[PDB]
Structure 1
């Protein structure tokens, strides 16, 4: 290329890049406000949770862990936070 701006790259390229290999490294993970049917009592859930998270109101189940992102249960409504 021989000339380029390494301080103001494109957001497309920075999202294409690996999280550590960006200009400033930071997480691609996020949190969710999750509603279970019935008990509103919204629960904060991490995307890559590692635990079978369940609401304090009842042991319903909220998210099952996977190798990456957690799989939220079928009857649930989530809000990116």
Structure 2
């Protein structure tokens, strides 16, 4: 520490690269996403850390896979946040 540093107003990601409950306001580090690949032609919305298999109603019947954190998607783009 330079022992005089500001703490009222932090840098956009040089003082918001910190742990999420050590920030001034607590934010998640997760997001939603609007998908719609071909294997299942429907506008699905899915959480980033899936935690469970997300099913498909088309020819496919799998979209995700829950790993140790985020979730590995598949061969279908479909991406957004949106906003959060």
TM-score greater than 0.5 by the shorter chain: yes
Higher relative helix content: 1
After TM superposition, where is structure 1 displaced by more than 6 Å over at least 4 residues in a row?
A: none
Any stretches of 5+ residues in structure 2 without a counterpart? none
After superposition, give the CA deviation of every residue in 1:41-80 in whole Å (9 maximum; x if it has no partner).
111110111011023x23521110001000001x211212
Any stretches of 5+ residues in structure 1 without a counterpart? none
- TM-score normalised according to structure 2 size: 0.81
Contact 1:36 1:62 in 2 (8 A): no
Higher relative strand content: 1
Aligned-pair distance for 1:38?
4.5
RMSD: 1.6
